[PDB]
Design a protein around this ligand. Sequence first.
Ligand SMILES: Nc1nc2c(ncn2[C@@H]2O[C@H](COP(=O)(O)O[C@H]3[C@@H](O)[C@H](n4ccc(=O)[nH]c4=O)O[C@@H]3CO)[C@H]3CC(O)(O)C[C@H]32)c(=O)[nH]1
Ligand SMILES: [Cl-]
Ligand SMILES: [Cl-]
Length: 397
Amino acid sequence: MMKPEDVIKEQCARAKVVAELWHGFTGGAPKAALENLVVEFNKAQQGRCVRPVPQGGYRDLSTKIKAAFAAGKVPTMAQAFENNIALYLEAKALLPIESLGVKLQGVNLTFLNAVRFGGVVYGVPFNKAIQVLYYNKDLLKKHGVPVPATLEEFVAAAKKLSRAEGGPVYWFQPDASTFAYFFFNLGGSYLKDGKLVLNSKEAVEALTLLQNGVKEGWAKPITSGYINQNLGSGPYAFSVDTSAGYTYYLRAAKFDLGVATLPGRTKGQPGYGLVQGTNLVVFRQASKEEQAVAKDFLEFVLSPRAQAVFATATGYVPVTEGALKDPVYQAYAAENPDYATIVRQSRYAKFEPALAEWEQIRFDILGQAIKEAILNKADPKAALDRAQKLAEDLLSS
Ligand SMILES: Nc1nc2c(ncn2[C@@H]2O[C@H](COP(=O)(O)O[C@H]3[C@@H](O)[C@H](n4ccc(=O)[nH]c4=O)O[C@@H]3CO)[C@H]3CC(O)(O)C[C@H]32)c(=O)[nH]1
Ligand SMILES: [Cl-]
Ligand SMILES: [Cl-]
């Protein structure tokens, strides 16, 4: 049956110039909203079009971009994390954005700062997400437990509900993204006078908090799929998870889903969330005509309506001031207090390091330590000491 990618295919077959955009959206609301955005853009051009090409997941995309370098042909544009941008700048692969003529006035300074390398912007914030606290409104009401506003209330609530339901009710992936929440909110930072450190006392404390949660019966490790693909077996109260998960949790949940700001050290402020999602980069190899399509496409992506529509469709955070003044954004915020909660959460935001090696480290070295500690009951300090050695050895090579 006809789909957006068929409309795009036809638009691009008729186009005189096609700028390929390589992305990591495997489906769901993110892929649909990317494709909707592109259809709209392509309609307004006269045979100057973007062609989205799915490369799989984010890791699959960065592997395929690496392979594209080695075959000597890259797309016009791709999604990239900040650390992927640092790696692409080692090959001088990327065009400065402002040079293209993309205006970045009114882009979230948090987002603009993350894509600025030696003071030059190399990425356009596109699909930016923040961690939020997903919760089961039914299950908290069932036991008279308030939505926890502090890490202390969160622990207390997880223990109270786990005892009542006979099962661990805080669900989490044993991964670098989850670790980041507890780490940042315990005072952790990864760079110590510019050196990457995985085994600082806050890192040990954060990984020890999670392991103790599993041993005390209040934290449930999710070993297989996303948290929202595990719902329905046993009691669920809480997860800390990307706002881009919103639509997946909504579809999956057989209970009344809640979205809250993250528990923090005090009721003064929500906790910091990890910023995830990606920026758009433009490859130097692209033709003049392909770069001009990239320019107009990046200008369209940053428009208030494109941002309003994309962010309300997905639970991504609008990247511009102007998006919050767009009536489409405003109507959705009015009907759904979760949009507003997600934006409010976007104000308390921390990033991972932008090192070229950070992808490999976060998955294969830090992610593996966290797994060893959570699933194989490794001593948290021992597991992070090893991670630090392996990280040091990788950087040295
Ligand atoms: N390659 C690479 N990946 C990185 C890096 N830093 C973090 N991440 C990954 O960004 C994902 C967050 O990005 P986000 O755009 O916020 O959310 C994603 C999906 O996570 C989420 N999703 C999809 C299906 C589903 O059933 N549930 C669901 O939540 O929807 C979005 C589009 O797929 C995390 C998840 C991870 O992939 O396990 C590892 C994390 C890096 O440096 N490099
Ligand atoms: Cl899908
Ligand atoms: Cl469910």
